[PDB]
Design a protein around this ligand. Structure first.
Ligand SMILES: *[C@@H]1O[C@H](CO)[C@@H](O[C@@H]2O[C@H](CO)[C@@H](O)[C@H](O)[C@H]2NC(C)=O)[C@H](O)[C@H]1NC(C)=O
Ligand SMILES: *[C@@H]1O[C@H](CO)[C@@H](O[C@@H]2O[C@H](CO)[C@@H](O)[C@H](O)[C@H]2NC(C)=O)[C@H](O)[C@H]1NC(C)=O
Ligand SMILES: *[C@@H]1O[C@H](CO)[C@@H](O)[C@H](O)[C@H]1NC(C)=O
Lengths: 49, 56, 7
């Protein structure tokens, strides 16, 4: 079943007892944290065989 | 609990795993912040069940 | 409730 990805993450947050508005009121920040975290894993593999 | 959902002419709130439309109301929703913050928020009239009972 | 039932 298709779902908009931000609304999927709202249910992922709701599943850990954080009220779902906490995603939507911070979505820009949460995206920048996620993108930056992915960057560090690429660096770890690019260095640490 | 549900998702806001639309058939094109109307908006409803509906539980995730089985389609059932309900009128969007103060008693199936909750408030946070204001309209300037959220990405992709839309305009609709949320019902209040107390409002016709203002006789007292 | 009563802050509305002040009606
Ligand atoms: C969206 O759902 C609403 C509610 O079922 C539909 O509006 C109703 O349409 C019937 C005639 O088909 C009217 O007699 C009712 O009074 C309407 N109800 C309300 C709440 O206005 C609407 O037609 C649906 N639209 C689509 C595109 O499916
Ligand atoms: C949702 O409704 C608001 C009004 O409550 C709309 O805001 C107005 O939009 C016009 C056109 O851009 C502006 O000139 C007004 O200054 C706005 N008024 C206020 C009070 O903000 C808004 O456009 C609607 N949004 C959507 C996505 O439909
Ligand atoms: C959804 O995508 C369209 C272009 O496909 C864009 O115009 C619109 O602003 C987007 N809306 C949201 C809520 O992201």
């Amino acid at each position: 079943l298709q779902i908009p990805f931000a609304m999927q993450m709202a249910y992922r947050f709701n599943g850990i007892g954080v009220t779902q508005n906490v995603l939507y009121e911070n979505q820009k920040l949460i995206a920048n944290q996620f993108n930056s975290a992915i960057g560090k894993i690429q660096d770890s593999l690019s260095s640490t065989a | 609990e549900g998702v806001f959902v639309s058939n094109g002419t109307h908006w409803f709130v509906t539980q995730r795993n089985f389609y059932e439309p309900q009128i969007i109301t103060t008693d199936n929703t909750f408030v946070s912040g204001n309209c300037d913050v959220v990405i992709g928020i839309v305009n609709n009239t949320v019902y209040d069940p107390l409002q016709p009972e203002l006789d007292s």
